[PDB]
Amino acid sequence: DFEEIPEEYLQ
Amino acid sequence: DCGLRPLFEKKSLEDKTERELLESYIIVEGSDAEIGMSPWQVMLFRKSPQELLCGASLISDRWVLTAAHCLLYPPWDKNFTENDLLVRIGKHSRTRYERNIEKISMLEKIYIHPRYNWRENLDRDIALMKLKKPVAFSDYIHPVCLPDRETAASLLQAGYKGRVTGWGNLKEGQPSVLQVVNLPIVERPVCKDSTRIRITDNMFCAGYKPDEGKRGDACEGDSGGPFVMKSPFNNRWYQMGIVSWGEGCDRDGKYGFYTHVFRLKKWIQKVIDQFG
Ligand SMILES: Cc1ncn(CC(=O)NC(C)(C)C)c1CNC(=O)Cn1c(C)ccc(NS(=O)(=O)Cc2ccccc2)c1=O
């Protein structure tokens, strides 16, 4: 149920 | 500046239950945290899938302390490396992306105590994480103090209460927001007599006796988080323990076990000064 987070951090 | 909370000590406002702690100085069954109550609380977040791994704590702008079992535990094929996780600081909500409030960091290096005993009783369950770049502190992000021999000596006494926080299970449903619970430190004999596990001096246990009435404990999800105490001498919060392990959660006759931070401080120091 976790909200999506800025893709910038995922990279 | 450690241990002085922007929204509390710095404004001279006491939180709703810190007095209970002070009065003893002679997460299951906890309550919702207040905003800014634990500005050192960190969330370890796995990228894929996106999930809560463990709790952790900010000890400076570049370092985070957690339980080594959060990253490495061969019995469950767990061996997370740098590029597998993210550190989320400044949070109140478990699942929401708190835009403009929280900060997300990537890790440069993970350091696990060379003598962490995963093969037996989780002895020396501690690990340090070096963030790629310093986070800036704010009202919701501030580091906790690590104890000195004197503070440890005077506060870590049976009967004295500490505080545990985390977004872990509420029963052995996960909470909407950060949970908190205040627990008394238990006599080593009593800790020893409650389990078949070999208890070392690098650990301490906490919780209420079955006859004491009150209850509460940490649980899955909570591992890696801090057990803190407020010094009646300088009014700062110090992290005395790291949520480690337990047999179930809130079971009567059982107690939670924590990594003894002071006992391992020389390793912490060694790693920090040798690696910035
Ligand atoms: C912080 C916290 N408070 C209570 N718990 C336990 C917990 O959440 N149990 C479930 C998930 C069943 C509710 C926790 C989590 N901590 C962990 O998992 C860590 N953990 C691990 C890695 C292994 C075994 C453990 N509990 S146990 O094998 O008995 C006894 C034990 C202890 C140490 C080594 C081997 C076996 C345990 O607690």
Domain ranges for chain B: 27-38+144-262, 39-143+263-274
Question: How many other C-beta atoms lie within 10 A of the C-beta of residue B25?
Answer: 16
What number does CATH give the domain B39-143+263-274? 2.40.10.10
Structure determination method: X-ray
Which has the closest alpha carbon to B204: B162, B169, B168, B237? B162
Residue B204 and residue B156 in contact, taking contact as beta carbons nearer than 8 Å = yes
- CA B165, B168, B173, B175 torsion: positive or negative? positive
B105, B223, B231, B244: the catalytic one is: B223
- Please, what is the end-to-end C-alpha distance for chain B in angstroms? 19
Q: Which residue(s) pair with B77 in the sheet?
A: none
Distance of residue B113 Cα from the nearest chain A Cα, in angstroms: 27
Per-residue CA distances from B148 to A1, B1, B154, B160, B274 (Å): 40, 15, 10, 17, 20
Name the strand (E) or helix (H) holding A5.
none
Say whether B39-143+263-274 and B27-38+144-262 share the same fold: yes
Q: Would the CB of B256 count as within 6 Å of ligand 1?
A: yes
Residue B70 and residue B54 in contact, taking contact as beta carbons nearer than 8 Å = yes
Q: Domain B27-38+144-262 class?
A: mainly beta
Q: Which residue(s) pair with B103 in the sheet?
A: B89
Residue A9 and residue B85 in contact, taking contact as beta carbons nearer than 8 Å = no
Q: How far apart are CA B99 and CA B114, in angstroms?
A: 38
Q: Do B104 and A5 touch (CB under 8 A)?
A: yes
Name the strand (E) or helix (H) holding A7.
helix A7-10
Cis peptide bond upstream of B39, omega within 30: no
Ligand 1: distance of its center to the CA of B245 in Å?
4
SS (H, E, C) chain B: CCCCCCCCCCCCCCCCCHHHHHHHCCCECCEECCCCCCCCEEEEEECCCCEEEEEEEECCCCEEEECHHHCEEHHHCEECCHHHEEEEECCCECCCCCCCCCEEECEEEEEECCCCECCCCCECCCEEEEECCCCCCCCCCCCCECCCHHHHHHHCCCCCEEEEEECCCCCCCCCCECEEEEEEECCHHHHHCCCCCCCCCCEEEECCCCCCCCCCECCCCCCCCEEEEECCCCCCEEEEEEEEECCCCCCCCCCEEEEECHHHHHHHHHHHHHCC
Looking at residue B164, its amino acid is: V
A9: nearest CB among B51, B52, B104: B104
Ligand 1: distance of its center to the CA of B223 in Å?
9
- Best mutation site among B73, B245, B247, B259 for ligand 1, i.e. most ligand atoms within 8 A of its Cβ? B245
Residue B259 and residue B67 in contact, taking contact as beta carbons nearer than 8 Å = yes
Resolution for this experimental structure (Å): 1.8
Q: For residue B125, indicate whether it is catalytic.
A: yes
Name the 3-class secondary structure at A3.
Answer: coil
Name the 3-class secondary structure at A10.
Answer: helix
Q: Which residue(s) pair with B258 in the sheet?
A: B204, B243
Q: How far apart are CA B158 and CA B184, in angstroms?
A: 7
